[PDB]
Amino acid sequence: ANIVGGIEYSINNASLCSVGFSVTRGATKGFVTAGHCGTVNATARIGGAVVGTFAARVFPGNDRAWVSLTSAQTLLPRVANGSSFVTVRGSTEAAVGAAVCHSGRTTGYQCGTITAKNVTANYAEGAVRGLTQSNACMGRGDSGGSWITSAGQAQGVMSGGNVQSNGNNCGIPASQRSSLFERLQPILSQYGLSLVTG
């Protein structure tokens, strides 16, 4: 399968999450995503075919993970934006106030701005600290998906948000939205990963 940020993948033929970013760990191919999407050794599938397994994860506390892919997978320096793509050019972290977008299997490509950093989310499983907040809307299933600037700087992966009864927070004003992502930099260093860029 072609690995593109934002696309859907299943975990153990059950839950569905979104791909974060194509990365390499030496000769090993992989993609980063959210830790709550799967447990170590869980099987990832795209297009009905097995593409790899969860190599490591931290959740709660943090919300990160990376999926180790088979050599047959095709890593790409891109994130889905509708039928088009946003090229991943680096991982420079944007400051509060910057515009940012994310790609997910549920709400597509949504944009907004970064409103706060170091935010704690109190999830069912426990607290997750150090998350960055944005007012771009999101929905269940977007988890693990790419957060990136229009200039191609990868910011992090979708962790959670204040979704409403319809499963997303797109139905309420931006001023009332809290969409949270796990910073990319600590994920890359935690697992010795290098971002695939173009």
| Contact by Cβ (8 Å): 107, 170 | yes
Based on the structure, what is the number of domains in the chain? Answer: 2
14 shares its domain with 33: yes
Nearest alpha carbon to residue 45 among 23, 74, 67 = 67
CATH number at residue 124: 2.40.10.10
48 shares its domain with 91: no
* 147: its two tokens: 């957060």
Burial-class residue 23 by CB neighbours within 10 Å (0-12, 13-18, 19+): buried
- The yes-or-no answer on residue 102 being catalytic is no
What domain range is 105 assigned to?
77-183
| Contact by Cβ (8 Å): 66, 30 | yes
60 shares its domain with 101: no
> In 36-52, which positions are buried (b, 16+ CB within 10 angstroms) versus exposed (e)?
bbbeeebbbbbeeeebb
22 shares its domain with 67: yes
125 shares its domain with 142: yes
91 shares its domain with 179: yes
Which of 10, 36, 102, 134 is catalytic? The answer is 36
* 161: its two tokens: 């948000």
Separation CA 27–CA 18 (nearest Å): 23
**Entry resolution in angstroms?**
1.2
Exp. method: X-ray
| Contact by Cβ (8 Å): 144, 17 | yes
The answer for residues whose C-beta is within 8 angstroms of residue 61's C-beta and 6 or more apart is 126, 127, 128, 129
188 shares its domain with 94: no
Separation CA 133–CA 57 (nearest Å): 21
Which of 63, 103, 159, 178 is catalytic? The answer is 63
7 shares its domain with 31: yes
The answer for residues whose C-beta is within 8 angstroms of residue 158's C-beta and 6 or more apart is 18, 20, 34, 102, 104, 138, 142, 143, 144, 145, 146, 147, 179, 180, 181, 182
189 shares its domain with 172: no
Separation CA 144–CA 43 (nearest Å): 15
95 shares its domain with 192: no
| Contact by Cβ (8 Å): 100, 148 | yes
- The yes-or-no answer on residue 103 being catalytic is no
Separation CA 143–CA 159 (nearest Å): 5
Phi, psi of 176 (to 5 degrees): -105, 0
The answer for residues whose C-beta is within 8 angstroms of residue 152's C-beta and 6 or more apart is 86, 87, 88, 89, 90
Reported residue count of the chain is 198
146 shares its domain with 191: no
| Contact by Cβ (8 Å): 63, 128 | yes
Separation CA 18–CA 141 (nearest Å): 7
Do the strands 74-81 and 2-5 form a parallel or antiparallel pair, or are they unpaired? parallel
Which of 18, 22, 91, 143 is catalytic? The answer is 143
**Secondary structure in 3-state letters for the chain:** CEEEECCEEEECCCEEEECCEEEEECCEEEEEECHHHCCCCCEEEECCEEEEEEEEEECCECCEEEEEECCCCEEEEEEEECCEEEECCECCCCCCCCEEEEEECCCEEEEEEEEEEEEEEEECCEEEEEEEEECCCCECCCCCCEEECCCCEEEEEEEEECCCCCCECCCCCHHHCCEEEEEHHHHHHHHCCEECCC
* Termini Cα distance of the chain: 19
119 shares its domain with 97: yes
